[PDB]
């Protein structure tokens, strides 16, 4: 309690907040998805609503501390507003992302920050053939809105999406779910742009 | 009036806010449900809307005071933003929780805090067989999003859900309603994961 | 202008805000309703949407002043956020209350505060028989969420609801509208729980 | 840039904010409407949605300055939260007013403030006969919620509503649109109550 | 990291925020659109929902710095709340604009600021003839709500709208998309009013 109050004061009130990664000091943001349910499928507007967990993970030198100095505290929990968070957003989103969980991140002594917010995302997806046996395949690209490849480097611990937490009595069943890291190049800009393409193949139950 | 103004000033303006429970200093959060109505049942998207009271109860040493010192004041009411609140959220939620009551908590001299917000929750539930006599059973797990068993220990005063405040002229009648405390242990991590499973068996009137 | 600026400064900037009524210093909150329209009636979910004026009235010793001292000012208007307001909310509400008017209260020299916000409330009501000649009767209890009878004492100036401001070309006509003060007791505790029961009998036009 | 920063600092940071008009110091608020479109017409709930511009105009002695003293600056733009705004709201509104434009006001050297927010208003209107050639007439009264005639005096520069900005390919065409200043007198209270009655006669295209 | 923290501190914490452009010091705001999808088309209310990128670009002398002085930093990213942003809004909007991306702007050493927020806009558009081969043409004017031509001068780098990022499996295909700069003078006011007219010709797939 007392040691934890001193730790948060020496990390946020003492040192100024992280201004973001630069080309000289890049940051590696490892992200993984945990698909919960395909709630709505709109064939009239070509919109699909997803319920998932966006496991965001990054390591900062500014959020590093010795546990021995702060009463053997290895890790702590703090609000997402108190710390810097990556701007990883869906490029093909149709409606603003609805946060279903409290925005709280876990910070460890080595500076590794883990933030897993539960989100409801309505994105661009044509569901023509969802009632079919082969189903319909729909992709949605996730990545940094302003930072490029030289600033934020996206990573995936596994190519497979976590479907263990998926709703058993869902209206739509998953046939395939993959999170592939893609390195894109744009004519405008010489810098590369990394994006995690969430490809989901689903059909009606 | 005058003694109450001094009490709130000596508790919030003097001492810094609670940073959250740690492994060394755990917290026991006792929660109970009071089901009011099953407003909406969506068979098209497998979503069910519930109106209930989430009776959150926890004891803090920081919010302790002697009533004799503060003009025999045994308890007081303060905004939920002024004090620390547990991150108890539904794991199978589809849409953000709608708060129907003012977020105000009751703090007693022994440090016990009681916060009962009225909420509207839309969660994952297959209502196939709601028109049947046996009805349909739907569960929703409630627990801390970031804190584990070593930090927040969930508790239930009773295994039965309060149905005395349930709407008599509701579209759906309750056959069974139970709030069971579940302790999950995984091969990954040695920490326990406590969640209150709200199981409700209901049918059409 | 100049005398009014000094009055508001000597009342809010000088003295700290009202912490709420205690058992030793109780408060009498007189409330009355002015029904405007029954906008929506949902037979599918048993929800009824009401448009009304909640005339909240209470007297505080802290908001008392001599008009002769402040340039013969008898009363003034201030934002509902600047002053303390009672937590009077509908116990059978289904969706959060939508405020249709600016939240501004009128404070008189004797300390009497009048706050009349226009609200849209969607509450639990079975409308089976609204198309009938006798119509359907639906009640909704209004009261303090955290304070009991020893802290907040509810009062009604009249048992009849103001229907003079009711919409003439409404889809539903009012047959009866009453605001009854009800006292609820529990064996445990000696504190009474006062609530204003808004009973409305209506039918289709 | 530099002269404008000094001007805003000498007007808001120096002098305290306007507490509102009193009986001794009344304020004249001139308002005009610019109807854009009749988006929705609900015959089931007797609700009509309007898209319009509410041109609010008032003169304050506190917001007066000499342009010669502040580098020949005749007028400036500031947020609606930084200055005092009148509580002009629709008395027959069914849903909260949706603001479609940024809430920014234009303040001139003579103290005249102009605030024109684009709004979407859902109000009480029976549309029985909208498909007819003569159409349907629907009125909505606009006025101060707390201030009476002795505090806020409403004014209209013209009795005709601006229909030059009205959508040509709208589902409903305007036959007549008038903004009439009405003074209401009650035997109860000697104070008058001024309201701008927006009368619109429309039919299907 | 260290040089970037000093740069943001010397730009925002040192100098006060931009008060907005004046007649003496005008600002040129270059804006371009990147149409993603025509999600909804409502023939009942004459409303059309668009998903697009509003590329806002302006140069400020206050946000200028020498990269050699701040460790060869050419550009940085900061929140849209930390800096001044133009009040560019759609004049024919029916519902408030939904922001789908994080509001973060890119600031370069020469003072050029680029802010590209992804937005969902529901505006006035008659879709009679969308099922036809020639399709339906719908325009929406974009511009500063309070600042005139003498304060904010709108510009377009190209007359053609970026359709490279448009959804291939959309319900509606684009036949033509143009962003035309229009300078209109009104009888009311002596100042010119510049607006970017987004004209889109589309049909069903
Ligand atoms: N298409 C998604 C993303 O692409 C990366 C990118 C960024 C800037 C530019 Cl100038 C070009 C490309 C994006 C993000 C923000 C705006 C436009 C596009
Ligand atoms: N499903 C909701 C919750 O489950 C508890 C839980 C946590 C971690 C692990 Cl490894 C297993 C289970 C949750 C909270 C945070 C992250 C992911 C999930
Ligand atoms: N039934 C609605 C409301 O009643 C007031 C009341 C408060 C406390 C107690 Cl111990 C009993 C009743 C309410 C509000 C909050 C919690 C439980 C109930
Ligand atoms: N209709 C909105 C407002 O009208 C002004 C008005 C004030 C007093 C009276 Cl007695 C009548 C009308 C209002 C505000 C409070 C109560 C009732 C109405
Ligand atoms: N139609 C869009 C815009 O037109 C420019 C304009 C500005 C002020 C005035 Cl007094 C007249 C016209 C606008 C912006 C604000 C209010 C009304 C209209
Ligand atoms: Br940080
Ligand atoms: Br606390
Ligand atoms: Br008060
Ligand atoms: Br002001
Ligand atoms: Br700025």
CSV table of C-alpha atoms in Angstrom, one decimal, chain D residues 70-201:
chain,number,residue,atom,x,y,z
D,70,UNK,CA,-5.8,45.6,-28.5
D,71,UNK,CA,-4.1,46.0,-31.9
D,72,UNK,CA,-7.3,47.0,-34.0
D,73,UNK,CA,-9.1,43.7,-33.2
D,74,UNK,CA,-12.8,44.3,-33.9
D,75,UNK,CA,-14.0,40.7,-33.1
D,76,UNK,CA,-12.8,37.2,-32.0
D,77,UNK,CA,-14.0,33.6,-31.7
D,78,UNK,CA,-14.1,31.6,-28.4
D,79,UNK,CA,-15.6,28.3,-27.1
D,80,UNK,CA,-19.3,28.4,-25.8
D,81,UNK,CA,-18.0,27.0,-22.4
D,82,UNK,CA,-15.6,30.0,-21.9
D,83,UNK,CA,-18.5,32.5,-22.0
D,84,UNK,CA,-22.1,32.7,-20.5
D,85,UNK,CA,-24.8,31.3,-22.9
D,86,UNK,CA,-28.7,31.7,-22.6
D,87,UNK,CA,-30.7,28.6,-21.6
D,88,UNK,CA,-33.0,28.8,-24.6
D,89,UNK,CA,-34.6,25.3,-25.0
D,90,UNK,CA,-37.6,23.8,-26.8
D,91,UNK,CA,-40.5,23.3,-24.3
D,92,UNK,CA,-42.1,20.4,-26.3
D,93,UNK,CA,-38.8,18.4,-26.9
D,94,UNK,CA,-39.1,14.5,-26.7
D,95,UNK,CA,-35.3,13.6,-27.0
D,96,UNK,CA,-32.1,15.6,-26.0
D,97,UNK,CA,-31.0,18.1,-28.6
D,98,UNK,CA,-28.1,16.8,-30.8
D,99,UNK,CA,-25.5,19.4,-31.6
D,100,UNK,CA,-24.2,19.0,-35.2
D,101,UNK,CA,-21.7,22.0,-35.3
D,102,UNK,CA,-18.8,23.1,-33.0
D,103,UNK,CA,-20.1,25.2,-30.0
D,104,UNK,CA,-18.0,28.4,-30.7
D,105,UNK,CA,-19.3,32.0,-30.3
D,106,UNK,CA,-18.2,35.2,-32.1
D,107,UNK,CA,-17.6,38.2,-29.7
D,108,UNK,CA,-17.4,41.8,-31.1
D,109,UNK,CA,-15.8,44.9,-29.5
D,110,UNK,CA,-19.2,46.4,-28.6
D,111,UNK,CA,-19.9,43.3,-26.5
D,112,UNK,CA,-22.3,41.7,-29.0
D,113,UNK,CA,-22.0,37.8,-28.9
D,114,UNK,CA,-23.3,35.7,-31.8
D,115,UNK,CA,-23.7,31.9,-31.3
D,116,UNK,CA,-25.2,29.8,-34.2
D,117,UNK,CA,-25.2,26.1,-33.3
D,118,UNK,CA,-26.6,23.5,-35.8
D,119,UNK,CA,-29.1,21.3,-34.0
D,120,UNK,CA,-31.2,18.1,-34.5
D,121,UNK,CA,-34.4,18.4,-32.4
D,122,UNK,CA,-37.0,15.6,-31.9
D,123,UNK,CA,-40.3,17.3,-30.6
D,124,UNK,CA,-44.0,16.7,-30.0
D,125,UNK,CA,-45.9,17.0,-33.3
D,126,UNK,CA,-48.9,15.0,-34.7
D,127,UNK,CA,-48.2,14.4,-38.4
D,128,UNK,CA,-51.8,13.3,-39.3
D,129,UNK,CA,-52.3,14.9,-42.8
D,130,UNK,CA,-48.7,15.3,-43.9
D,131,UNK,CA,-49.5,13.3,-47.1
D,132,UNK,CA,-52.4,15.8,-47.9
D,133,UNK,CA,-52.0,18.8,-50.2
D,134,UNK,CA,-52.8,21.4,-47.4
D,135,UNK,CA,-50.2,19.6,-45.2
D,136,UNK,CA,-49.8,19.5,-41.4
D,137,UNK,CA,-49.0,22.5,-39.1
D,138,UNK,CA,-46.7,21.9,-36.1
D,139,UNK,CA,-45.5,24.4,-33.5
D,140,UNK,CA,-42.6,24.2,-30.9
D,141,UNK,CA,-42.1,27.0,-28.3
D,142,UNK,CA,-38.5,28.1,-27.6
D,143,UNK,CA,-37.5,30.1,-24.5
D,144,UNK,CA,-35.5,30.4,-21.3
D,145,UNK,CA,-36.1,27.5,-18.8
D,146,UNK,CA,-35.4,29.4,-15.6
D,147,UNK,CA,-35.3,33.2,-16.4
D,148,UNK,CA,-38.6,35.1,-16.8
D,149,UNK,CA,-39.5,38.2,-18.9
D,150,UNK,CA,-38.0,40.6,-16.3
D,151,UNK,CA,-34.6,38.8,-16.7
D,152,UNK,CA,-34.4,37.6,-20.4
D,153,UNK,CA,-36.3,39.5,-23.1
D,154,UNK,CA,-36.6,37.4,-26.3
D,155,UNK,CA,-36.6,39.1,-29.7
D,156,UNK,CA,-36.9,38.2,-33.4
D,157,UNK,CA,-35.3,40.3,-36.1
D,158,UNK,CA,-37.9,38.9,-38.6
D,159,UNK,CA,-41.1,37.0,-38.2
D,160,UNK,CA,-40.2,34.8,-41.2
D,161,UNK,CA,-37.9,31.7,-40.8
D,162,UNK,CA,-34.8,31.5,-43.1
D,163,UNK,CA,-35.7,28.8,-45.7
D,164,UNK,CA,-32.9,29.8,-48.2
D,165,UNK,CA,-30.6,27.0,-46.6
D,166,UNK,CA,-33.5,24.4,-46.7
D,167,UNK,CA,-32.7,21.1,-48.5
D,168,UNK,CA,-34.2,21.2,-52.1
D,169,UNK,CA,-34.4,17.3,-52.4
D,170,UNK,CA,-36.1,16.9,-48.9
D,171,UNK,CA,-38.8,14.3,-48.3
D,172,UNK,CA,-41.0,17.2,-46.9
D,173,UNK,CA,-41.5,20.6,-48.4
D,174,UNK,CA,-42.3,23.8,-46.5
D,175,UNK,CA,-45.5,25.7,-47.2
D,176,UNK,CA,-45.1,28.2,-44.2
D,177,UNK,CA,-42.5,28.8,-41.5
D,178,UNK,CA,-42.9,31.6,-38.9
D,179,UNK,CA,-41.0,32.6,-35.7
D,180,UNK,CA,-43.5,34.5,-33.5
D,181,UNK,CA,-42.6,36.2,-30.2
D,182,UNK,CA,-45.3,35.4,-27.6
D,183,UNK,CA,-45.7,36.9,-24.1
D,184,UNK,CA,-47.5,34.7,-21.6
D,185,UNK,CA,-49.3,36.1,-18.6
D,186,UNK,CA,-50.5,34.2,-15.6
D,187,UNK,CA,-53.0,35.3,-12.8
D,188,UNK,CA,-50.7,33.5,-10.4
D,189,UNK,CA,-47.5,35.5,-11.0
D,190,UNK,CA,-47.0,39.1,-12.1
D,191,UNK,CA,-43.9,38.3,-14.1
D,192,UNK,CA,-44.3,37.8,-17.9
D,193,UNK,CA,-42.9,34.7,-19.7
D,194,UNK,CA,-41.6,35.4,-23.3
D,195,UNK,CA,-41.3,32.4,-25.8
D,196,UNK,CA,-40.5,32.3,-29.5
D,197,UNK,CA,-43.1,30.0,-31.2
D,198,UNK,CA,-41.6,28.2,-34.2
D,199,UNK,CA,-44.7,27.4,-36.4
D,200,UNK,CA,-44.0,25.2,-39.5
D,201,UNK,CA,-46.6,24.1,-42.1
